[PDB]
Design a binder for this molecule. Structure first.
Ligand SMILES: COc1ccc(CO)cc1O
Ligand SMILES: COc1ccc(CO)cc1O
Lengths: 208, 208
C-alpha cells in the first residue's frame, strides 16, 4: 500500500528549476540538509525542556553522514523531531509554495541557487545531486513513514516497516551517475568543514 | 501583578557578553529581530495551511518598523505566531542555554558577535543597542503578555492590558543614549536593504 500524490504546481516548478538550471556549485545541498537536521534537533530539544519524556524515543541528538558506494547513496540521519504523515505530504513541514514564490523573484533580483535555504525550501536542493530521494521519518505522535520522489511531478508515501528508527529523519540520496564525488570521504569532510562548522550537534561521517 | 524571574546563568552570561564586549557592528540587531519575525510569520502561515481559523486573529502577515524619537524607541512588530507565557519565560521560545554554549565556543574558534543568529539566540542582540527591551506577545492559545528586561540577571512578566494586538510579537527597544542613529529613517532603510532584502513578508518603515 503506496499512496501517490501530485506536487503542487509551484513545488514541481522549483524541482524542475533545480534539475534544469546549469549551476556548478552543487555542494551546497549538504549544508541545506544538515541545517534542516539542526532545526529539527532544536525542536525536539525545545519540547524536552518542558516534557522530558519526548526524549524517550532516544536521548542522543546528532547527525550521521553515511556514504555507500555500492548503493550509490549518501544518507543524512538526524534524531530530530521527525515529521507526521501530514507534515510529510504538506511539503516536508515547509511553506514551500510561498517559499518558491519568494525564491523565484529573488532569482530575478540577482540571487543564485545557493541562497535556496533563505526561502525555507532547502530540502529540494537534494535534487542538485540525487536522481531519487527517499525520506524516512518518525515523529513521537505518529508512525514511521517513507516518502519517495524522482521528481517528475509526483511523490509517494507508504508506512515504513523497514528498520525502526525510534525518532528522526533519514534522507537517502540516490546520487546521479556523475555526482559520486559526494561519496568520497575527503570531499564530504571538506564540505562539512566549509559550510557546516558551527552546527551545534555532533556530525559523524561514517566510513566504508 | 508583575512576576520577576532570574535568567538562567548562561543567558545572563550571554547578555553580559553582548553588553560588555567592544564590538562596533551593532547594526546587525535589526537583521536578527526581523529574522525572528520572519520565522514566526512562517509558523502561523504553516499552521493555517491545515486550519485556516488560525488566521482569525488577523490574516495579514507582515513586519512593521516604528521609530519614535520622543520616546527613544524602535519597535519591531510582527503578526507571527506569538508566544505563550511558557515560551516567553523559557527564553522567548529558544534553546538559549545550549545556543549560548555553542556561540561561546564559536567565539573561541574565531567567530564574531554578528554570527549570533546561527546559534539561535539572536533576540539577545537587542542588547547591542537597547538599555531596556519590552516584548509584547499574543499567541492564539493564550493571553497577551508583556516581558521586560534591562538585563542585570532578571526579567519580568505581566499580563498586558495595553492595546490588544490580535496576534504576534512586538519588540520595543528603549535605545541607549548614544544609539539614536537607529531612529533615523535613512539609516533604518539602509540596514534593511543591506541585511534583510530577501525577507518574504512586507516590511513597512513608519515615518514620524
Ligand atoms: C523536521 O525534520 C526534518 C524535516 C525535513 C528534513 C529534510 O532535510 C529533515 C528533517 O530533519
Ligand atoms: C515566535 O515569535 C517571536 C519570538 C521571538 C521574537 C524576538 O525577536 C520575535 C518573534 O516574533
Amino acid at each position: 500500500e503506496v499512496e501517490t500524490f501530485a506536487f503542487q504546481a509551484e513545488i514541481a516548478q522549483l524541482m524542475s528549476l533545480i534539475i534544469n538550471t546549469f549551476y556548478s556549485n552543487k555542494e551546497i545541498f549538504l549544508r541545506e540538509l544538515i541545517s534542516n537536521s539542526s532545526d529539527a534537533l532544536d525542536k525536539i530539544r525545545y519540547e524536552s525542556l518542558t516534557d522530558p519524556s519526548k526524549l524517550d524515543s532516544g536521548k542522543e541528538l546528532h547527525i550521521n553522514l553515511i556514504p555507500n558506494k555500492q548503493d550509490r547513496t549518501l544518507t543524512i540521519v538526524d534524531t530530530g523531531i521527525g515529521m507526521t504523515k501530514a507534515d510529510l505530504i504538506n511539503n516536508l513541514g515547509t511553506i514551500a509554495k510561498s517559499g518558491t514564490k519568494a525564491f523565484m523573484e529573488a532569482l530575478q533580483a540577482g540571487a543564485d541557487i545557493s541562497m535556496i535555504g533563505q526561502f525555507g525550501v532547502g530540502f529540494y536542493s537534494a535534487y542538485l545531486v540525487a536522481e531519487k530521494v527517499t525520506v524516512i521519518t518518525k515523529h513521537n505522535d505518529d508512525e514511521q513513514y517513507a516518502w519517495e520522489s524522482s521528481a517528475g511531478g509526483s511523490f509517494t508515501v507508504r508506512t515504513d516497516t523497514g528498520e525502526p528508527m525510534g525518532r528522526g529523519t533519514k534522507v537517502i540520496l540516490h546520487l546521479k551517475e556523475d555526482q559520486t564525488e559526494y561519496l568520497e570521504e575527503r570531499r564530504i569532510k571538506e564540505i562539512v568543514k566549509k559550510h557546516s562548522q558551527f552546527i551545534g550537534y555532533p556530525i559523524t561521517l561514517f566510513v566504508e
